């Protein structure tokens, strides 16, 4: 598909598409390719995710949904339509598209077609409305009513397939083919009128049923089982985690670029023991005025260094002019661009790309000369 490294690099249209709008990427591409000579294929090698992100934006489509139902006409009455809705109507209904392509534009304009379509009985039939003989409809669109009937039979065959015996209702009525009993009352049969023919309410029920079947089937596009379904999962053994445990041993070598005897500690401990019990003079803590100056002199030495560091700890204000600064930024950016591609193949570890390393080296040398 058009989401892999190979196809994305070779898709010229996509690369020009985002680059057309993407300004920051455009600035670097113009400098590092038009004049510097970096091959286009190498430039997009490190920007694969950028290409995929833009493609995915326009490479996805919404799911099927009932569109004619949403269309509510709401003396003058106005109904709002949008191109996205227009495409949805064609996708969810091929009869509308059939009468649209062969008519628009040959006889009249598109706006009249949709006004013609809505006023026609074809729109009512597709929307599920019960057709009323009183309604006049449109003469041109009504010509496709018979054609739509043929598609309905074709769609029924398209949806007709053998069904699993678990939920096969046909077999239940065919379990005994010689059942003879009282016919069900009229409440348990499709409605009929005085003349005896169908009232037509069954047709809309099939139409909505057909719409759902087509929508579900469209999902399964080109892009043992009963054993598990009937199993009682609640009675089976509870799921058990299979996480791996780890034990960390702590033993590392020491960092690499007179010992006091036991009695000495006791001897020294006694000295502090006596020096503490006998008396304690806090006033002796004051320096002698000869080391305080040295202590202060070295402490400030760090203060001055720290103060200089911290006084300069969005972009910082600069002294260079805008023209020179912009040129310097471009030179820094183009040199950095060459550095990345050079390291990818220089550190690739495959001798196949030796020529690229030599070629990438040349531009780096030119950067030194340019700098």
């Amino acid at each position: 598909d058009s989401l892999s490294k190979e196809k994305l690099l070779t898709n010229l249209k996509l690369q020009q598409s985002l680059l057309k709008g993407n300004k920051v990427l455009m600035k670097v591409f113009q400098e590092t390719v038009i004049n510097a000579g970096l091959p286009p294929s190498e430039f997009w090698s490190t920007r694969i995710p950028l290409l995929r992100a833009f493609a995915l934006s326009t490479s996805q489509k919404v799911g099927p949904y009932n569109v004619l139902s949403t269309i509510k006409p709401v003396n003058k009455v106005n109904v709002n339509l949008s191109r996205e809705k227009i495409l949805n109507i064609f996708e969810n209904y091929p009869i509308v598209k059939k009468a649209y392509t062969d008519n628009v534009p040959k006889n009249f304009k598109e706006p009249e077609f949709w006004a013609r379509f809505f006023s026609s009985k074809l729109f009512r039939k597709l929307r599920g409305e019960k057709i009323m003989q009183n309604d006049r409809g449109d003469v041109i669109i009504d010509r496709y009513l018979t054609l739509d009937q043929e598609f309905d039979r074709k769609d029924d065959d398209m949806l007709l397939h053998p069904v699993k015996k678990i939920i096969d209702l046909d077999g239940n009525i065919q379990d005994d083919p010689v059942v003879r009993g009282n016919r069900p009352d009229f409440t348990m049969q499709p409605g009929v009128d005085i003349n005896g023919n169908s009232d037509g309410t069954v047709d809309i029920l099939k139409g909505m049923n057909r719409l759902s079947e087509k929508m579900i089937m469209a999902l399964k596009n080109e892009y043992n089982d009963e054993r598990n379904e009937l199993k009682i999962d609640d009675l089976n053994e509870s799921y058990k985690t299979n996480y791996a445990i780890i034990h960390l041993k702590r033993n590392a070598h020491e960092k690499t670029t007179l010992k006091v005897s036991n009695q000495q500690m006791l001897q020294q401990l006694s000295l502090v023991m006596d020096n503490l019990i006998n008396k304690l003079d806090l006033n002796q803590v004051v320096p002698n005025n000869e080391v305080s100056n040295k202590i202060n002199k070295r402490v400030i030495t760090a203060i001055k260094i720290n103060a200089k560091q911290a006084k300069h700890n969005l972009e910082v204000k600069s002294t260079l002019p805008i023209d020179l600064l912009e040129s310097c930024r471009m030179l820094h950016t183009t040199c950095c661009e060459f550095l990345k591609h050079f390291y990818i193949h220089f550190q690739s570890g495959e001798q196949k790309q030796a020529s690229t390393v030599k070629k990438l080296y040349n531009h780096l040398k030119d950067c030194i000369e340019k700098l």
Binding site: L12, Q16, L19, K20, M26, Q30, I34, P40
Partner: peptide
């Protein structure tokens, strides 16, 4: 200007198509 940068890109991409083709 962006328009000038677009034209040279179109000419450059046109050259790419001409070169690749």
């Amino acid at each position: 200007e962006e328009r000038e940068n677009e034209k040279t890109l179109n000419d450059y991409y046109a050259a790419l198509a001409k070169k690749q083709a």
